[PDB]
């Protein structure tokens, strides 16, 4: 209810950080399957 914390209240709110994480969770595991399967 009232009186959250300090370390809960120090977070910047509408930063990205989780689009950057969601992209890197779908780009890094999708590009390791590109260099393991690569011949020109």
């Amino acid at each position: 209810a009232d009186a959250k914390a300090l370390d809960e209240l120090r977070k910047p709110k509408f930063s990205s950080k989780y689009l950057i994480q969601h992209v890197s969770q779908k780009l890094i595991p999708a590009v390791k399957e590109w260099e393991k399967s690569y011949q020109p």
């Binding site: 370390d7 950057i20 890197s24 260099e35």
Partner: protein, 290 residues
């Protein structure tokens, strides 16, 4: 949870939601959990792509924690703002901006034999006001040789270009003799001390003028956004903003199960806690757990 390569990146980080992911990870390792073995894999192109996307998860909450010095007088708010972004570079795994942009030059031009191809592959990182002043001086030294000026250094045709480009670099205002004598060094530590004090007098006057040019563009953007908004009637404003707020909520409610949309709507509930905790005691502010 974190993937154990994020948590190695969040150790020297100092934002809140990354330290509480570290602190609950270190509390798990106190209760006898095994630290998982970090990957001795992920070749040179994938390693530079994980470093690109893990530094940007340290930079993104850190940029939102740095107050812009908008509408301030003096250099020290602009020097504080620049120093907080320097420290955000070091926390996210970047080096000095001098050492990180010159690495960008030598990487984009690893295959350059002529300096006209240097001046076209380092185009994105050098100012077009300075890329043009190095292209006009290039075509004069191209006129004296009538052969492409080489990226060799041993060539005398480059040595007359490098004495003409040094005349350009002092015309912009940057001491090309001081910059060169820093990244080359000297033998004794006493004569290298006086050139480092003269490089860092340029460097601090350099990065202040990039931070102050960034502040003067946010000040000019906000003053034109406001003056466009002050010319509206107040009934238009409230529904232009309620349309933009509701469309942006619905984009986070369309996205189900995503971590970003779960955290987006959880921060909307934390803004509404802030507005409600202030309403209970406005001379006290928000109530923190103490």
């Amino acid at each position: 949870a974190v993937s154990k390569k994020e948590v190695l990146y969040f150790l020297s980080s100092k934002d809140a939601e990354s330290s509480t992911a570290v602190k609950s990870y270190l509390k798990s390792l106190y209760a006898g959990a095994q630290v998982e073995a970090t990957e001795t894999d992920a070749s040179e192109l994938i390693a530079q792509l994980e470093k690109k996307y893990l530094s940007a998860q340290v930079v993104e909450p850190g940029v939102h924690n740095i107050a812009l010095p908008l509408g301030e007088s003096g250099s020290a708010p602009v020097k504080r703002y620049a120093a907080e972004l320097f420290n955000l570079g070091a926390q996210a795994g970047f080096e000095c901006p001098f050492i990180e942009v010159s690495k960008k030059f030598g990487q984009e031009t690893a295959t350059s034999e002529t300096v006209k191809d240097v001046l076209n592959k380092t185009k994105s990182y050098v100012s077009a006001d300075y890329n043009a002043a190095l292209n006009e001086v290039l075509s004069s030294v191209e006129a004296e040789i009538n052969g492409p000026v080489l990226f060799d250094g041993k060539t005398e045709g480059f040595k007359k270009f490098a004495a003409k480009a040094k005349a350009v670099a002092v015309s912009r205002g940057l001491p090309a003799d001081t910059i060169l004598a820093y990244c080359a060094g000297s033998a004794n530590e006493d004569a290298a001390d006086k050139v480092s004090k003269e490089f860092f007098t340029w460097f601090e006057s350099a990065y202040t003028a990039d931070a102050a040019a960034e502040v003067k563009a946010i000040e000019a953007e906000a003053a034109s956004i406001l003056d466009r908004h002050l010319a509206k009637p107040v009934a238009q404003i409230r529904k232009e903003q309620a349309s933009a707020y509701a469309s942006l909520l619905k984009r986070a409610e369309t996205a189900k199960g995503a971590k970003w949309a779960e955290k987006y709507l959880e921060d909307v509930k934390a803004v509404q806690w802030f507005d409600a905790s202030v309403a209970e005691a406005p001379a006290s502010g928000p109530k923190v757990a103490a």
